Structure 1
Amino acid sequence: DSRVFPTQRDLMAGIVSKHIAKNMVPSFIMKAHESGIIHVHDIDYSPALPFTNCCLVDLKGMLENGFKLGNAQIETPKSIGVATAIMAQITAQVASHQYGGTTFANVDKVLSPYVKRTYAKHIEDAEKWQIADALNYAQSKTEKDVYDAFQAYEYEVNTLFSSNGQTPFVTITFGTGTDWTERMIQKAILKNRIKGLGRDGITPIFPKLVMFVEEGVNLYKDDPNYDIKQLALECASKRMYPDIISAKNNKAITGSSVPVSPMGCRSFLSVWKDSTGNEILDGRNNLGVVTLNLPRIALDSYIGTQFNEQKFVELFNERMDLCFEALMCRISSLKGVKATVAPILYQEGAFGVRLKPDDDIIELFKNGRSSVSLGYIGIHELNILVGRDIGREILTKMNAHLKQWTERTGFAFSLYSTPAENLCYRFCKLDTEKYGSVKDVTDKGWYTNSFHVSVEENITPFEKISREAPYHFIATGGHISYVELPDMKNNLKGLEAVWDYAAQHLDYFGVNMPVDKCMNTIRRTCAYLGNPNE
């Protein structure tokens, strides 16, 4: 809410920070942001404080070894219920030290050792109490211990607030686990999600659930986990989540030999290797987002009422540079900042390393370890303004710019399809104060997300999936495609159809359907789940 204390204290800190940013960001960058030319995200956090954006938490390396959480020296969990309890405490802590989402990748694989542990204890207890049905007593207890554990993770995520009086934006991914412990975790999460939250079993907005689907594991009636896929479909039909990621396309796009979980909503890392040649994923992050307002480059290049191509070219080049200056300006503020700024992130392992209190954090992000995002929005409205479809082309040229940035600074710049849950209105409003109502651009009040096909089009699901799929291979830093569907609670084979089509053709995908009960109304009209009643 906003009338609430934690939110109010946060707004105060936001205000002080926006003011401090005015004294740190070169005026030409602030003026372009104030006017809607670009959008420097999270200015109410950074650069006042050297926060970073989103991340894949290295939960595996923290549970295995131990780590200091506050005053306490936590030790490897002896139980699955203790490892998820700890996962929640880490979720709360990481949320409070970065301003972006937090992702726990492959919880099925990561937490499996603890499910095994729980089992060993129910067996050493099935003989300690000479229990009739031994192997069966374990199977049950363990199963219950695992459901309750994720049910409690899910509950904790929904009650625990950050340092901002907000519920954490956390993402949990699974799907590539085949072992019985890995399968049990997956089912546990899907089952508990269907059950819903609390007495009225309502639909949770967090954690976001993303499932990997790969041939020979998940998508064909013959794979080991095809039954989980079925459960996942039901879940999606009743709670919107999980979204799915195509292991096949995801690996080709990222260059990673293992599926890449999105940090936060949809920010994807590119493949990276440590000094000894190892492919690292967990513990990596993103340094921020600066979004480029694409319709506005077209609008500003109109002469009278017609488009001027030569003007577009000059402005596009001018604005790409501006964006670059904006991303570097804040990355530069990270210089000289010490690991003392966020112990959970830099010292106790969430970022997969152990820096001393006096080590500079900036060194950890260099040479491609961290990604940096150049966002964009409204290809649909840009196409309309320039007379034709330049979607794939503008993005391709943006990437060529990004490659040069990467080679000059060492940071791994990528193209990001900004979720823009609110930026979609903000850019449109600022452009409207200058151009008024422009048919099919600023007239509906918002811009279309990244490269998505406008909502006003009457596209068949497969067409939409097909018209959007190539963007998943161009905007490698972050992307997703949605399809609108009616209630499919009783048409799972239909939803599986859409899933299988998206899975083959694109990367990250999700389905928007209506999900209401005797009054708990949820819709995903943009990026997050929400009640469009308020």
Structure 2
Amino acid sequence: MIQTVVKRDGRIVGFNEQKIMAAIRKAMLHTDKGEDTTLIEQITDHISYRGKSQMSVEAIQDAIEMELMKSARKDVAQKYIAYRNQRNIARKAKTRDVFMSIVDTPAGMMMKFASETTKPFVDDYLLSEDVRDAVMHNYIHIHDKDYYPTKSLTCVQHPLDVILNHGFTAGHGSSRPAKRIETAAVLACISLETCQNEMHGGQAIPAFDFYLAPYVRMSYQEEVKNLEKLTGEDLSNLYDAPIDDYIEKPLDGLQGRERLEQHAINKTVNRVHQAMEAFIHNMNTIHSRVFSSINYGTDTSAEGRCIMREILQSTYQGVGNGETAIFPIQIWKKKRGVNYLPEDRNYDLYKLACKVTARRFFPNFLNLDATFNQNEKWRADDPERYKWEIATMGCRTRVFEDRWGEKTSIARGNLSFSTINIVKLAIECMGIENEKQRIDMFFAKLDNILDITAKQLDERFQFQKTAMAKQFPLLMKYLWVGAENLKPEETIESVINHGTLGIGFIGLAECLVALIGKHHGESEKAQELGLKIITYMRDRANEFSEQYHHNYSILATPAEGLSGKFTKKDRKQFGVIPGVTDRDYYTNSNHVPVYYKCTALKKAQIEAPYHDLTRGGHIFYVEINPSVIESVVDMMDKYNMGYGSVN
């Protein structure tokens, strides 16, 4: 017989036959007909004679189910094998994440639930047949698929003045204009973090200098008024008194009316200083609690320089007890005639920027004079030059050109983008030995995959339109080109076309290995094909733009949600191949693989033409004194490099 049973916790107890009996009884009591001891006795006696000296709970339940199957009453087992499993899941949720297998902070868990619920429904009921077939076999990737039912857009560039000038009202919240520096950065943060809930991407504030520039004068005037309230003087000509730069130096060593004019500047500089560190800390804490970006570096006034110096000092110091802040992402604009050469006005700020970037990895650098960023309306005397300066985002996105509007990056955004798998096509075609036929097949398949991707992007577009204005309280009332003309319940079909659609690529070196023995950064013949394929994609993009009445651009994906999602599913189907499916990366859009020893010069040489070719986004990342970054910036200027991020 059986004498000892080991409980699940670990205790050892004696064999009681009255517990294997009540369990089956409760299972039977919910199955229409409910029987009596006639079968209970048989099952219990059969179990308690064939067993060993000591048993476990799980083994006994295995025996119970095995006997309840080999009976005539099989409607009692199907209510056993279910209750037991529910209890297993319940007792396994005290230390694990069982609820996720079926489909840490509370908010993150709820968001995971929602994402997993939404994704398959879109994958089934919304896409079309050809698109679905393409997606299933690992040919393309639709970025941010879980927000599809919400007719959402990617990002925007805030016209921050339209909110500071007048008052903004969202829901029951209302806010008046600003009248000093402290109440300006706060409103900038409010508007920057209020629009995340209306979009599924990053946020940016261009012209960080000009928009806040008028707000370094107001505090100066107020301080003068307070310094002439008690003194009885009539310092009425100090209001619009031209200034050279808001520098601060010690006060002792003067007297009279020249003593009450250096103090005001000192207090004003301190006031402006505290606000910027508050801004940085706020944006840094919000993330852990929200991508963000700010652009500056091309203002030659006296207030703009003050703001730039204050922000640079605050970032160089750090946050908290000296830690490096992760946000906001800061980007420095370089132009030939403003801040580059020693004779230019803002050389000192450039040197300070290099000093800080040598340590805290910000700001990045954006060549404002590249051959594909220049604009033919930038006038150095206008007080509104910023309207003709390119601006970029932390996601490496570019929105400059337009076939039906002006050439600006203000109050514009991106609407979607999808990446295309290219290594798989080369591996698939690898079969035939003749070289020419492999290239012919590659070009034959690339066209079809491109057509499918374009159709998917257009269908996304057609769905995104038809969204009422009220669904986006802030974006479609103050921060989009056509706002101020849209009624609360009108569709946004008349202003949506001022946007962009991207087609991204990933892993070109592997694609080259599958058609030649060397990648782009090892053999001269290799690059002649990479250039050709990128050129093919750009030409087809132009054709699609003409056909569908939209804007299309090529893209180097940021590699944030799609890093290994492609290589794993490719090793399984086709198995290991040397140097193609053996690393668990797939390299980025068009860089040189990180595992190949190469210098800065050669990498830049091989990469610049691609920068020219990819209008929708590009990068040039190099991993390592303030003089080091000078070499990087000079390298960017020498060639047509657009956006560098050395750090």
The 3 A distance-change label for structure 1 pair 426 and 306 is farther
The answer to whether the Cα contact below 8 Å between 2:402 and 2:551 also exists between their aligned partners in 1 is: no
Corresponding residue for 1:284?
Answer: 412
What letter is aligned with 2:312?
Answer: L
Q: Which has the higher contact order (CA 8 A, sep 6+)?
A: 1
1:440-519 correspondence runs (5 A): 440-485=579-624, 491-505=625-639, 506-512=641-647
The 3 A distance-change label for structure 1 pair 289 and 319 is same
Corresponding residue for 2:505?
Answer: 376
What is the deviation of 1:25? 1.3
Residues 1:29 and 2:131 are matched in the alignment: yes
Which region of structure 1 is more displaced relative to structure 2, 376-385 or 319-328?
Answer: 376-385
What is the deviation of 1:306? 7.7
Corresponding residue for 1:168?
Answer: 290
Task: Give CA-to-partner distance per residue, 1:281-316, whole Å, 9 cap, x none.
Answer: 211000011011122221222226787222212210
Corresponding residue for 1:338?
Answer: 468
What letter is aligned with 1:198?
Answer: G
Q: Distance in 2 between matches of 1:34 and 1:118?
A: 60
The answer to whether the Cα contact below 8 Å between 1:20 and 1:48 also exists between their aligned partners in 2 is: no
TM-score (structure 1 length as normaliser): 0.87
Match of 2:144 among 42, 49, 52: 42
The answer to whether the Cα contact below 8 Å between 1:157 and 1:206 also exists between their aligned partners in 2 is: yes
Higher alpha-carbon Rg: 2
The answer to whether the Cα contact below 8 Å between 2:312 and 2:353 also exists between their aligned partners in 1 is: yes
The answer to whether the Cα contact below 8 Å between 2:141 and 2:418 also exists between their aligned partners in 1 is: yes
What letter is aligned with 2:318?
Answer: G
What is the deviation of 1:133? 3.0
Which structure is higher in strand share? 1
CA RMSD of aligned residues (A): 2.3
Corresponding residue for 1:488?
Answer: none
Secondary structure, in 3 states, of the residue corresponding to 1:104? coil
Corresponding residue for 2:490?
Answer: 359
Q: Distance in 2 between matches of 1:255 and 1:371?
A: 22
Which region of structure 1 is more displaced relative to structure 2, 237-246 or 427-436?
Answer: 427-436
User: How many pairs are equivalent?
Assistant: 496
Q: Distance in 2 between matches of 1:251 and 1:176?
A: 18
The 3 A distance-change label for structure 1 pair 472 and 118 is farther
Which region of structure 1 is more displaced relative to structure 2, 11-20 or 173-182?
Answer: 11-20
Moved segments of 4+, more than 4 Å: 253-257, 304-307
Residues 1:396 and 2:542 are matched in the alignment: no
Secondary structure, in 3 states, of the residue corresponding to 2:564? helix
What letter is aligned with 1:98?
Answer: M
Corresponding residue for 1:435?
Answer: 574
What is the deviation of 1:256? 8.0
Identity over the aligned pairs, expressed in percent? Answer: 27
The answer to whether the Cα contact below 8 Å between 2:206 and 2:294 also exists between their aligned partners in 1 is: yes
The 3 A distance-change label for structure 1 pair 129 and 429 is farther
Task: Give CA-to-partner distance per residue, 1:450-492, whole Å, 9 cap, x none.
Answer: 111221232222222222111121101111101111xxxxx21
What letter is aligned with 1:36?
Answer: N
Residues 1:177 and 2:299 are matched in the alignment: yes
Task: Give CA-to-partner distance per residue, 1:424-457, whole Å, 9 cap, x none.
Answer: 2112222222222222222111122111122123
The answer to whether the Cα contact below 8 Å between 1:203 and 1:239 also exists between their aligned partners in 2 is: yes
Q: Distance in 2 between matches of 1:266 and 1:247?
A: 15
What letter is aligned with 2:334?
Answer: V
The answer to whether the Cα contact below 8 Å between 2:152 and 2:200 also exists between their aligned partners in 1 is: yes
Corresponding residue for 1:187?
Answer: 309
Q: Distance in 1 between matches of 2:394 and 2:482?
A: 17
Secondary structure, in 3 states, of the residue corresponding to 1:215? coil
The 3 A distance-change label for structure 1 pair 483 and 79 is same
Corresponding residue for 2:455?
Answer: 325
The 3 A distance-change label for structure 1 pair 452 and 126 is farther
Residues 1:246 and 2:339 are matched in the alignment: no
1:57-456 correspondence runs (5 A): 57-130=158-231, 133-160=259-286, 168-199=290-321, 201-249=322-370, 252=373, 257=378, 258-272=388-402, 279-303=407-431, 308-349=438-479, 353-354=483-484, 355-366=486-497, 369-387=498-516, 388-389=526-527, 390-456=529-595
What is the deviation of 1:120? 2.2
